[PDB]
Design a protein around this nucleic acid. Structure first.
Length: 88
DNA sequence: CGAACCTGGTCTTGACTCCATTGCCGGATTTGTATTAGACTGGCAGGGTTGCCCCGAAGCGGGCG
């Protein structure tokens, strides 16, 4: 995005693997969200029975899981559920 | 016989009062958003009941290419 405007006609290999990494990041993000959907379901099974329906609670948990996978850090050496339970 | 008078109003001038009406201003309360790092990973859940009728769809016996 920086080198698109006012930038450079990059080499073909550099632009091609730049697009490869740009696709791989979104593939990994979709893979991580689809991995932890089950954790969202297992947490949201207990807030039912009052007011809201079950599937709306599942969807709001999914949105919180989106925020948790956006703000998750790996260098703190903790597991992902430890951080994601707060946001969910 | 005229004449004051006395009193309906008709109206104005000037001072006074008084309360809306914004306008800041300082603070109070109200409302919205962001962030919490050990690990946690696929629901509880509640019932099955009539009678009659119409009609549309699934499936099976039965011949056929």
């Amino acid at each position: 995005t920086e080198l698109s405007e006012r930038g450079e006609k990059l080499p073909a290999a550099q632009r091609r693997d730049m697009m490869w990494i740009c696709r791989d990041g979104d593939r990994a993000k979709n893979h991580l969200l689809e991995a932890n959907l089950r954790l969202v379901v297992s947490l949201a099974k207990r807030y039912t029975g009052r007011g809201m329906a079950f599937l709306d609670l599942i969807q709001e948990g999914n949105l919180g899981l989106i925020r948790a996978v956006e703000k998750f850090d790996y260098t703190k050496g903790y597991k992902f559920s430890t951080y994601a339970t707060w946001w969910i």
